[PDB]
Amino acid sequence: KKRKRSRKESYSVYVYKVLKQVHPDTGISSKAMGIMNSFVNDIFERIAGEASRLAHYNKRSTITSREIQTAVRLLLPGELAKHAVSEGTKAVTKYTSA
Amino acid sequence: KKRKRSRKESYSVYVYKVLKQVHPDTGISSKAMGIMNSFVNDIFERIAGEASRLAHYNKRSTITSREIQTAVRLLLPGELAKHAVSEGTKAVTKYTSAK
Amino acid sequence: ARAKAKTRSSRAGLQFPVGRVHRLLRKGNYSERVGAGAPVYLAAVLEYLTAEILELAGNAARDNKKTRIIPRHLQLAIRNDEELNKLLGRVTIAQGGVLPNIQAVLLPK
Amino acid sequence: ARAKAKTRSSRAGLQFPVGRVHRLLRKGNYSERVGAGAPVYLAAVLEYLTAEILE
Amino acid sequence: RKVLRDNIQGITKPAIRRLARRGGVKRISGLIYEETRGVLKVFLENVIRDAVTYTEHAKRKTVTAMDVVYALKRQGRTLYGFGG
Amino acid sequence: KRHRKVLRDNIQGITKPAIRRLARRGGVKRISGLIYEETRGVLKVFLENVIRDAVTYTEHAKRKTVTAMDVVYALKRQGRTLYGFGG
Amino acid sequence: KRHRKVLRDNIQGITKPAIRRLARRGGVKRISGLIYEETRGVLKVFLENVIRDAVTYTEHAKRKTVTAMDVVYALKRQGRTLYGFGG
Amino acid sequence: KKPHRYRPGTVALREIRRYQKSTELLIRKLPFQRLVREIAQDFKTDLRFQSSAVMALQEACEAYLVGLFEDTNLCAIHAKRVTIMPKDIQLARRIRGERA
Amino acid sequence: KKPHRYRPGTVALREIRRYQKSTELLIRKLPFQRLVREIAQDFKTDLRFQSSAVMALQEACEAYLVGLFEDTNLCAIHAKRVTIMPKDIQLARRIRGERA
Amino acid sequence: KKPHRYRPGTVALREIRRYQKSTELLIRKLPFQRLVREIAQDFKTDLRFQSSAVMALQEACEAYLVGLFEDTNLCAIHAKRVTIMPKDIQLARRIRGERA
DNA sequence: AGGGTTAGGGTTAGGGTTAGGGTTAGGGTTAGGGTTAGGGTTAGGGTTAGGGTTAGGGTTAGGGTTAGGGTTAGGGTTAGG
DNA sequence: CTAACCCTAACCCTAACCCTAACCCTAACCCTAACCCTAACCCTAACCCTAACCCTAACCCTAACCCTAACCCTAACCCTA
């Protein structure tokens, strides 16, 4: 009858943009794009699940930047966790300033 | 304490009643009671999380007896899951017959 | 016009707090809507599991010439029940030892 | 009125959908309230991880 | 028509030998093929039972790669590529 | 007063008879000589990880005292659910 | 009884302008921001390598005090003979 | 009368290297589909699987078999041996926690 | 069975049977309490450990050590041996997936 | 309003000349004493250093840092650059034979 | 109040079907080298003990610390465009 | 409406001293296991090639997914026992 087919959400445009920002000469196949889409979704679900567990342990019905920073330091290892925390702090500082 | 303090929650009364029902003239310890409470809480949280995940996968928003039965069949093994499903169906039938 | 207030545990025949289970399902951020038969089903499953575990613990205590249930008897019953050991595989019971299992090679000549 | 509608990605400097992250945090049954800096933090962490993996 | 006894034998000996060579095995014993087939059959039975339970919960009659990935992640083996 | 602090006489705190009794409780008849050092190192690494997790949890809770609840939470996050102590 | 700060100068003192003053002595005009950490690290490892030999020299005579003579004797072994302070 | 026969070892090593420097599959698809169909027949009748589903199943099974073979080879090397054994497979499954 | 000399290997079996029927702690508290404080110094100073945290820590450590010793003993008899060795603990930890 | 701001370069050059035409020290004494005490704590406890000893240590460390900075600046000048880099420091330590 | 239920048609899609030839396995063959059986060597801790460092309560005090309660205001929420 | 603010009640964590007593350290003797050498078998390494068989290339179609249209019951929020 009608068209109106469901639209599947994906991060293919953001991964390709990061690729062009890092290596503006390489390409990403469809399988690699699907792998990166499953990796981003799995990490996002693991961090959101860790932040929800922290918000449920401490009697507080909110999720601020501290809950995400703690979930990052608990999931990521050493240097990666510190770099991600520094990037997040720089981002929130640029947001609170600009 | 008793200085406008807060009261926790537990299942000691229910565990003691279940123990008295399944076996009279027996006893239990505080460590065993705490272990049983932790086991009940862990199983409850696991089944609730499994039901929520199944409801999110089914593109639905309500966790019902079907979702709970599926979570039980996925978590519990074989004959234990079958007996739990039978008891749950009997309880649902009793609730439907009388409320 | 309240007549009487009957308890959900009495109307369900179980010995578990269906009201507390429903409140935990509603405040646990699991779903926006919580069914009616789902708390009763979960309470019945938990009651059956608790009854089985308590029966195993009582049998172990009666076999060990004891009246009270100790974590040692609980761990013994859990390790004896194959289904319980497969269900709680990554669970360590505090204040409890393992089973005296000696291999054939470790036995004296 | 409304002047102009600037994108959250441009105001944040990242290349990740902060709006989609916020919508997923609000509809994912994680918490009744979702902060403002938490989606930006998660997007920055995910962008750094994706950049490292792609490099 | 399909011989349910001619399915464990479907995992041929050269296939298991090539899998062991890809893993890093130089010499493969004779009684390894039967045990490998049994372990693979048990694992496939568990995964297919999980997928059947998921399909019955979804009120469907077709097992999908999404349900397979969900069951594999529930067991503790997250697979990428096939799905999302 | 107390003008001293803890030293490295701590890896040696896990005495040899204690490790021997632990191996006998597990089911070991003969214990080698170079097992104590490796066991102490593995135990130190595990304790370091668990204590780091507990410190992170305490810093997230805006507190300065590590609690058995936080210890149990960290142990369950690793994959080792402990019963009895807590709830 | 004891100092509440048990950090005991965790490679401190080697501040940014302190390094920005030693590099200008050699002839460095533009000093990168990622140089302070490496400078602190190389200073720490050099001080460790020197203090190890100093302690090894002081422990021979059953003495519990480190003198400048032992320090210059340990520095001579590394290949850097200092005049004036030792003697 | 010399085809220059290879001594037992070099052929195995070069085959290991060739199979490690590749990304293709090893087990066939139709026998695996028949096997998973026969297994699914023991639960619900009249079932229709998927091509991507059976492909992911074969990939996961091949990865699990590769890991099990690696663990068995490591156990054999530790046991002063070079060939795998069913006792080594049993010990690997017992240590990994799969025995049930 | 003279009280002067006993056959080596027989007293260990009685000790194993006696220690496998008790649930008391083998590691002592005071030596273990200082190890927990010394590790937490590198992360953050001015920390107060509760009286129930050290007990759970010691219990978990004892359980992990018992499991590792059982795995090492299971790996020891595989090579026609009866005693444990440092080369077996490494393999037992690598098969479990901890050392990676 | 005006302060006659100096362009980046003249201030650095005059500071280099002023610090080269002097004989005083740059690093403080008490932080260096605390650092060498913390380092010596990792070997033998209850150690008492000397004022002349820590002074000679600070002098030798300052001379070594000056030499390393000179080598790094020379490497940067050879590399068509004017600023130092951690890669330049690593290459200088690799050529000098200090490794890590 | 709207998520779930029902009936309805479209619409992708997987099972069923054909054939074939090019890839690969099945069962029997020659024979190398690894395996577990053996016996000889060595030192590795097992077992006992008695000198003695150090641990479990037994019973105090002090002042850090969590937060109970109250106040209030602002960020997440809800809605439409 | 819930989280950032302040006063503050009480708790729980730490500091410190004792009394030996279960437990820990070494060094004294010795038995049997870990380990190297070696030799006998039989097990699987290495073909192998003709037959098994599979996936390549398509057709279809009828059971199944679900899409968007109608409608109501289930779920929640309120108060107050």
Swiss-Prot record, chain B:
Entry keyword annotation includes Endoplasmic reticulum: no
Modified residues (Omega-N-methylarginine): R60, R66
Chain residue numbers at which the record places covalent cross-link Glycyl lysine isopeptide (Lys-Gly) (interchain with G-Cter in ubiquitin): K8, K94
Chain positions with Phosphothreonine modification: T89
Chain positions carrying an annotated carbohydrate: S86
Modified residues (Dimethylated arginine): R53
GO biological process, one term: antibacterial humoral response
N6-lactoyllysine sites (modified residues): K17, K59, K82, K90, K94
Residues the record lists as N6-glutaryllysine modifications: K8, K17, K20, K82, K90, K94
Location of the protein in the cell: Nucleus; Chromosome
N6-methylated lysine, modified sites: K90
N6,N6,N6-trimethyllysine: residues carrying this PTM: K59
Residues that bear N6-succinyllysine: K8, K90, K94
Modified residues (N6-(2-hydroxyisobutyryl)lysine): K8, K17, K20, K31, K59, K82, K90, K94
Residue numbers carrying PolyADP-ribosyl glutamic acid: E9
N6,N6-dimethyllysine: modified positions: K31
PTM field: Monoubiquitination at Lys-8 (H2BK34Ub) by the MSL1/MSL2 dimer is required for histone H3 'Lys-4' (H3K4me) and 'Lys-79' (H3K79me) methylation and transcription activation at specific gene loci, such as HOXA9 and MEIS1 loci. Similarly, monoubiquitination at Lys-94 (H2BK120Ub) by the RNF20/40 complex gives a specific tag for epigenetic transcriptional activation and is also prerequisite for histone H3 'Lys-4' and 'Lys-79' methylation. It also functions cooperatively with the FACT dimer to stimulate elongation by RNA polymerase II.
Residues where N6-crotonyllysine is found: K8
Modified residues (N6-acetyllysine): K59
Official protein name in the record: Histone H2B type 1-K
Species in which this protein is naturally found: Homo sapiens (Human)
Swiss-Prot record, chain D:
Subcellular localization(s) per the UniProt record: Nucleus; Chromosome
Modified residues (N6-(beta-hydroxybutyryl)lysine): K4, K27
Domain of life: Eukaryota
Residue(s) carrying N6-crotonyllysine: K27
Post-translational events: It is involved in the initiation of both imprinted and random X inactivation. Ubiquitinated H2A is enriched in inactive X chromosome chromatin. Ubiquitination of H2A functions downstream of methylation of 'Lys-27' of histone H3 (H3K27me). H2AK119Ub by RNF2/RING2 can also be induced by ultraviolet and may be involved in DNA repair.
Positions of crosslink type Glycyl lysine isopeptide (Lys-Gly) (interchain with G-Cter in ubiquitin): K4, K6
N6-(2-hydroxyisobutyryl)lysine sites (modified residues): K27
Record's compositionally biased regions (Basic residues): 1-9
Similarity field: Belongs to the histone H2A family.
Subunit and interaction comment: The nucleosome is a histone octamer containing two molecules each of H2A, H2B, H3 and H4 assembled in one H3-H4 heterotetramer and two H2A-H2B heterodimers. The octamer wraps approximately 147 bp of DNA.
Function: Core component of nucleosome. Nucleosomes wrap and compact DNA into chromatin, limiting DNA accessibility to the cellular machineries which require DNA as a template. Histones thereby play a central role in transcription regulation, DNA repair, DNA replication and chromosomal stability. DNA accessibility is regulated via a complex set of post-translational modifications of histones, also called histone code, and nucleosome remodeling.
UniProt-recorded name of the protein: Histone H2A type 1-B/E
Organism per entry: Homo sapiens (Human)
Gene: H2AC4
Portion of the full-length sequence here: 11 to 65 of 130
Swiss-Prot record, chain E:
Residue positions where N6-butyryllysine is found in the record: K13, K26, K59, K61, K73
Effect of P14L: In TEBIVANED1
Residue positions, PTM N6,N6-dimethyllysine: K2
Positions of modified residues (N6-(2-hydroxyisobutyryl)lysine): K13, K26, K41, K59, K61, K73
Compartment annotation: Nucleus; Chromosome
Cross-link Glycyl lysine isopeptide (Lys-Gly) (interchain with G-Cter in ubiquitin), where in sequence: K73
List of residues that carry N6-succinyllysine: K13, K59, K61, K73
Pathological condition linked to this protein in its record: Tessadori-Bicknell-Van Haaften neurodevelopmental syndrome 1: An autosomal dominant disorder with onset in infancy, characterized by poor overall growth, microcephaly, hypotonia, profound global developmental delay, impaired intellectual development, poor or absent speech, and characteristic dysmorphic facial features, including hypertelorism and abnormal nose. Other variable neurologic and systemic features may also occur. Tessadori-Bicknell-Van Haaften neurodevelopmental syndrome 2: An autosomal dominant disorder characterized by poor overall growth, microcephaly, hypotonia, profound global developmental delay, impaired intellectual development, absent speech, and characteristic dysmorphic facial features, including hypertelorism, abnormal nose, and wide mouth.
Family as reported in the entry's similarity comment: Belongs to the histone H4 family.
Name of the protein: Histone H4
Species name: Homo sapiens
Residues included from the entire protein: 20 to 103 of 103
Swiss-Prot record, chains H, I, J:
Modified residues (N6-glutaryllysine): K21, K44, K80, K87
Function: Core component of nucleosome. Nucleosomes wrap and compact DNA into chromatin, limiting DNA accessibility to the cellular machineries which require DNA as a template. Histones thereby play a central role in transcription regulation, DNA repair, DNA replication and chromosomal stability. DNA accessibility is regulated via a complex set of post-translational modifications of histones, also called histone code, and nucleosome remodeling.
Residues modified to Phosphothreonine: T45, T72
Chain positions with N6,N6-dimethyllysine modification: K1, K44
Name of this chain's protein: Histone H3.1
Modified residues (Phosphoserine): S22, S51
Positions of post-translational N6,N6,N6-trimethyllysine modification: K1, K21, K44
BP terms from Gene Ontology: chromatin organization; epigenetic regulation of gene expression; gene expression; nucleosome assembly; telomere organization
Modified residues (N6-crotonyllysine): K21
Quaternary data: The nucleosome is a histone octamer containing two molecules each of H2A, H2B, H3 and H4 assembled in one H3-H4 heterotetramer and two H2A-H2B heterodimers. The octamer wraps approximately 147 bp of DNA. Interacts with TONSL; CHAF1A; CHAF1B; MCM2 and DNAJC9. Interacts with NASP; NASP is a histone chaperone that stabilizes and maintains a soluble pool of Histone H3-H4 dimers.
N6-(beta-hydroxybutyryl)lysine PTM sites in chain numbering: K21, K44, K87
Record's keyword terms, sorted: Acetylation, ADP-ribosylation, Chromosome, Citrullination, Disease variant, DNA-binding, Hydroxylation, Lipoprotein, Methylation, Nucleosome core, Nucleus, Phosphoprotein, Ubl conjugation
A GO CC term attached to the entry: extracellular region
Sites of Phosphotyrosine modification: Y6
Organism whose genome encodes this protein: Homo sapiens (Human)
